[PDB]
């Protein structure tokens, strides 16, 4: 049993099928109370929701699926006909994400790509009938944000107005990506300050009273 399997099982057991909000809430309860996990969480999630609603993207690319928390969060706000493509290098994570999406009833809107982003990005247009992306959500390995952004550009996947939205730019941090975008006339940047997910960290004091030998 892995932590990610335990999250999925908790959702199947407690959340309402076909109800994306319920799924998100079940994931957030489990990770808040039982086991920390690197889902974006509800605080940053609300910012994502606001951005998605602003831009109403027809084609979104997610880098890093993990347990599918963000895929559920985004796909539930997509308009009819819109699509989310999500890249995930770990087959166990890809499997969990697909079951999460299935449970939430969002499977028709989302396509899971199994592989490393650096290998998949160049295949997007031909294999998945993509012209340019409306939005990209970055939340995979932090050292991949910058090289993948450069690859997206190279592959002709960015248009004027494509919205990149990156998690964890403060903690754990993405310093090369953040410096790059903030310094580049090719990007207009805005920072949305929030909180790292699930940080009510339990610790305690042990009192041990010596009784003699
Ligand atoms: O490390 C973090 N995220 C990495 C996530 C990685 C996800 O994406 C792929 S990697 C990949 C590679 C190539 N192509 C696709 C996916 C992994 O298999 C996992 O599904 C992280 C860490 C913390 N934290 O506090 O430690 C907080 C967070 O919010 C985080 O997102
Ligand atoms: Mg993250």
3-class DSSP string for 146-182: HHHHHHHHHCCCEEEEEEEEECCHHHHHCHHHHHHHH
Distance CA 101, CA 5 (A): 14
Ligand 1 and 113: CB distance under 6 A: no
Q: Which of 3, 14, 21, 1 is nearest to 198 (CA)?
A: 3
* For ligand 1, atom 13: residue with the closest CA: 116
Query: Residue 24 domain-assigned?
Result: yes
Distance CA 182, CA 180 (A): 6
Q: In this structure, what CATH number is given to the domain that contains residue 56?
A: 3.40.50.150
Tell me if 110 sits within 8 A of 87, measured CB to CB: no
CB proximity list for 65: less than 8 A, separation 6 or greater:
71, 86, 87, 88, 93, 94, 97, 112
Verify whether residue 197 is a known catalytic residue.
yes
Question: Structural domain of residue 32, as residue ranges?
Answer: 1-201
Question: Position of tokens 């559920």?
Answer: 72
Cα angle value 52/197/115 (rounded, 5°): 65
Return the ligand number nearest the Cα of 198. Answer: 1
Q: At 201, is the secondary structure helix, strand, or coil? A: coil
Query: Residue 105 domain-assigned?
Result: yes
Q: Are strands 83-88 and 110-114 parallel, antiparallel or unpaired?
A: parallel
Distance CA 65, CA 89 (A): 9
Residue 101: both structure tokens together: 């999406």
Cross-strand pairs, 110: 84
Considering the candidates 39, 42, 148, 168, report the single residue annotated as catalytic: 168
Ligand 2 centre from 70 Cα, in Å?
9
Query: Residue 145 domain-assigned?
Result: yes
Query: Residue 211 domain-assigned?
Result: no
Indicate the helix (H) or strand (E) that contains 9.
Answer: helix 3-14
Protein residues within 5 Å, CB atom, of ion ligand 2: 139, 167-168
Residue 39: both structure tokens together: 């889902």
Question: Position of tokens 């295949």?
Answer: 123
Put residue 110 in one of left, alpha, beta given phi > 0 → left and psi -120 to 50 → alpha: beta
Ligand 2 centre from 15 Cα, in Å?
23
Ligand 1 and 95: CB distance under 6 A: no
Domain count for the chain, please give it.
1
Ligand 2 centre from 205 Cα, in Å?
31
User: What percentage of the chain's residues is helix, strand, coil (to nearest 5)?
Assistant: 50, 15, 35
Distance CA 27, CA 7 (A): 6
SS (H, E, C) 66-110: CCCHHHHHHHCCCCCCCEEEEEECCHHHHHHHHHHHHHHCCHHHE
Query: Residue 213 domain-assigned?
Result: no
Ligand 1 centre from 36 Cα, in Å?
13
Return the ligand number nearest the Cα of 65. Answer: 1
Q: Which of 145, 203, 211, 141 is nearest to 179 (CA)?
A: 145
Tell me if 137 sits within 8 A of 63, measured CB to CB: yes
Cα distances (angstroms) measured from residue 2 to each of 65, 66, 115: 16, 13, 21
Residue 208: both structure tokens together: 């041990």
């Amino acid at each position: 049993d892995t932590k990610e399997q335990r999250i999925l099982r908790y959702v199947q057991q407690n959340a309402k099928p076909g109800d994306p909000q319920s799924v998100l809430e079940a994931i957030d309860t489990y990770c808040t109370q039982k086991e920390w996990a690197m889902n974006v969480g509800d605080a940053k999630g609300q910012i994502m929701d606001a951005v998605i609603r602003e831009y109403s993207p027809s084609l979104v690319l997610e880098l890093g699926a993990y347990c599918g928390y963000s895929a559920v969060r985004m796909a539930r706000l997509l308009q009819p006909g819109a699509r989310l493509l999500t890249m995930e290098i770990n087959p166990d994570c890809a499997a969990i994400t697909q079951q999460m999406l299935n449970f939430a009833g969002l499977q028709d809107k989302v396509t899971i790509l199994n592989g490393a982003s650096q290998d998949l990005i160049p295949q997007l247009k031909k294999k998945y009938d993509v012209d340019t992306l409306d939005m990209v959500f970055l939340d995979h390995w932090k050292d991949r944000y910058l090289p993948d952004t450069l690859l997206l550009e190279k592959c002709g996947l960015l248009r004027k107005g494509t919205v990149l939205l990156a998690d964890n730019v403060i903690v754990p941090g993405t310093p090369d990506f953040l410096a790059y975008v903030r310094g580049s006339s090719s990007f207009e940047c805005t920072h949305y300050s929030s909180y790292l997910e699930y940080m009510k960290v339990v610790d305690g004091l042990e009192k041990a009273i010596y009784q003699g030998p």
